[PDB]
Amino acid sequence: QQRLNNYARALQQLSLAVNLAQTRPLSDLEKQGLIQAFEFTHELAWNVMKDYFFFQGNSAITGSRDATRESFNKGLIKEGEIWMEMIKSRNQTSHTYNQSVADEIVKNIINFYHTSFQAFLEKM
Amino acid sequence: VRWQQRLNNYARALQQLSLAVNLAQTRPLSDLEKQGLIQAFEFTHELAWNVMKDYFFFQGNSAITGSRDATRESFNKGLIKEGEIWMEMIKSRNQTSHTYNQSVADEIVKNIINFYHTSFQAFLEKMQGLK
Amino acid sequence: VRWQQRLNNYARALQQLSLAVNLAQTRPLSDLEKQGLIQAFEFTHELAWNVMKDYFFFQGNSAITGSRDATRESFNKGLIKEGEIWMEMIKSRNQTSHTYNQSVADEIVKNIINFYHTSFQAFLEKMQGL
Amino acid sequence: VRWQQRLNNYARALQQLSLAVNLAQTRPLSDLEKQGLIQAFEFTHELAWNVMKDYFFFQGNSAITGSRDATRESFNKGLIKEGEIWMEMIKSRNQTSHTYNQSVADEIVKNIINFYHTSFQAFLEKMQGLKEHE
Amino acid sequence: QLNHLYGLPSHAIEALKCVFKEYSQIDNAILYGSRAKGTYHQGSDIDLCLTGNLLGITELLAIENKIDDLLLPWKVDISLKHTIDNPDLLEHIERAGILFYTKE
Predict the structure, then answer these.
(1) Which residues of B touch A16 (CB under 8 A)?
(2) Distances (CA, A) of D114 to D21, D101, D127
(3) Which residue of A has its CA nearest to D126?
(4) CA-CA to B26 of 20 to 30 Å: which in A3, A18, C91, E101?
(5) Do E88 and C2 touch (CB under 8 A)?
(6) How far C65 CA lies from chain B's nearest CA (Å)?
(7) Closest CA of chain B from D65, distance in Å
(8) Which residues on A lie below 8 Å from D62 (Cβ)?
(9) Which residues of chain B have a CB within 8 Å of the CB of E42?
(10) E77 neighbors E48 (Cβ within 8 angstroms)
(11) What is the CATH number of domain E10-102?
(12) CA-based torsion, A22, A27, A29, A31: positive or negative
């Protein structure tokens, strides 16, 4: 799909930020940048799922939750709990000005989300 | 009371955004720092237009629903003075998902540094004076 | 002057409200009629606080941002003498979305009949006397 | 979870609106009953677009701010079909704050009876179908 | 701050004229209110009255939705001419109204 290309780019930029995070500590602004990277990467990802399922005659996907559940049920993703947690993080975005929320989101990004994003790209 | 707590959260968010902007006005930012600046602008503007909505509900106006209505009413009632900049803020918000293209991100970052920060500070000063 | 045209429109709205009230005092209202009475009250109060805002803008005051500021300034300036009932008016306005709960609607129509209408008439008289 | 409670409240508001619309179907309405009909449409629509917002937040979309964004997303994702009719709903709200016009008042009543009510009921049927528990 | 007429920038006036050009039923549009009197402040409304005979409330609400989509900061109060029965408002439009747009 054409949106799969943009997803690969956004994920590439996200990988750059993650690879940088492993080597040295990130500043607050860089943590917010990683959160934004995850934002647009996950948007691209769940819209990829939506388009893939629409091409199979399924216009019943109404949002990222429906797409994530359908993909988990179709083996497109193996750990649906991680993607549910991703949805949870997306909804905490307006509250990243609180250090605790931002740190929680960043930790989830670096430990679990990146790997899931990469595995999803491999499958698509 | 409600709009005063929202205003305190807005003040914290604007402290963070001011740190970021002041960093941008002294040296060029990396792509990651530009994305972080965009995120900071996003949550600061969310707090700002929710502050407008809360304040106008407190005034007896319950017809405002979203950022558009809040911004227009704030412009009409004197809470903000440069409405076009806040409407462009809304347009920038609508472009958040396309910040992975560096052109969009650069445009939004320029708008944040050159215009949005001054407007946020002016709004913070105005609202604080109405407590 | 702007506040005088606003006062004419407010007089029209208050006359409609007076019709609705006199009906309420002649016989009980159905639920739909109560919703209509609430709507008429909302028209009247919107026009009233906009009259206040315009009048104060004629006096060189631009710090009126809504119905609350307008009511507080009208009380401080003597345009209204019972600011508590107008604060209650603001409360009733802000309850508009919940009038499908008939207890809320009943409270609002009770306030309209027993208090708000008389205050609107007194405010009309005051502004006509300026 | 939150959109389900909102949906229940919306169903009650719609019931009141249905009573008025069916009454108008049997006989003409007085000017007072017409204003009551507008009031019924206003608190029905207010709940309706908040159901859209709450549901899309449940779906993971926290970008919706107002009734405009909520209606657009509902049409895009299939929760509603007559996008234009719902956009017309939005500009029919808050006429208490936009002066007064009798002709306009009558046209909104006609639109409420002939189009809006049906859109509300279809939206209720769709959202209730998407509910699975509680 | 850089305005053209009625305290509005040129692009705002033209954007509104653009939206009126989509409707052949609009014979013209007359600006009234504070921006026609010069008694306007920075965030003052834009009061416009659409003169047209084929214009119904349907087009009225559609135009309002399009204006809203322009993402202008000012509020626009749009109203059809033949749908007004307020003698005072009519008097003001015919006395102080400025021709804001004309269909050609």
Answers:
(1) 32
(2) 9, 20, 22
(3) A60
(4) A18
(5) no
(6) 5
(7) 5
(8) 90-91, 93-94
(9) 75, 78, 81
(10) yes
(11) 3.30.460.10
(12) positive
* Contact between D77 and A94 using a beta-carbon 8 Å cutoff: no
d(CA A49, CA A37): 18
Question: Do residues B124 and B10 make contact, with C-beta atoms less than 8 angstroms apart?
Answer: yes
Q: Is the separation of the CB atoms in D71 and D47 below 8 Å?
A: no
State the CB neighbour count (10 A cutoff) for residue B114. Answer: 12
Strand order across the beta sheet in which E46-51 lies: E76-80, E46-51, E28-32, E98-102
CA distance C119 to E6: 38
How close, in Å, is residue E80 to chain D by CA atoms? 9
Give helix B31-58 / helix B67-77 axis angle, nearest 10°.
70
Contacts C97 to B, Cβ<8 Å? 62
Question: How many angstroms separate the first and last alpha carbons of chain A?
Answer: 9
Residue among D63, D65, D94 minimizing CB distance to B63: D94
In this complex, the residue of C32, C43, C97 whose CB is nearest that of residue D36 is: C32
| Angle CA E71–D82–D10, to nearest 5 | 90
| Residue A98: exposure state from Cβ atoms within 10 A (0-12, 13-18, ≥19) | middle
According to DSSP, the β-strands at E76-80 and E46-51 are parallel
Given E43, E68, E71, which is nearest B76 (Cβ)?
E43
C59 and C65 Cβ atoms separated by less than 8 Å: no
Do the beta carbons of residue D77 and residue A63 sit within 8 Å?
yes
For helices B117-129 and B2-24, angle between their N-to-C axes, nearest 10 degrees:
150
Say which residue the tokens 């991100």 belong to.
B105
Q: What is the spatial distance between Cα D116 and Cα D105, in angstroms, rounded to a whole number? A: 15
Contact E78, E11 (CB under 8 A): no
Q: What is the resolution of this structure in A?
A: 2.4
CA A39 to chain CA mean position, Å: 7
Closest approach of A17 to chain D, Cα-based (Å): 24
CA distance C87 to chain E (A): 26
Cα–Cα distance for residue pair B28/D90, rounded to 1 Å:
44
Residue A67: closest C-alpha in chain D: D59
* R_g (Cα) of chain C, nearest Å: 14
Experimental method reported for this structure = X-ray
Chain E residues touching residue C53 (CB < 8 angstroms): none
Strands E98-102 vs E28-32: parallel, antiparallel or unpaired: antiparallel
Residues of D in contact with C92 (CB under 8 A): none
Q: What is the DSSP letter of B30?
A: P
Residue A119 in 3-state DSSP?
helix
Instruction: Spell out the domains of chain C, with CATH numbers in brackets.
Output: 2-128 (1.20.120.330)
DSSP of E14-63, one letter per residue?
HHHHHHHHT-TT--EEEEESHHHHT---TT--EEEEEE-SS--HHHHHHH
Closest CA to E36 of E96, E102, E83, E103: E96
What tokens does B105 get? 């991100």
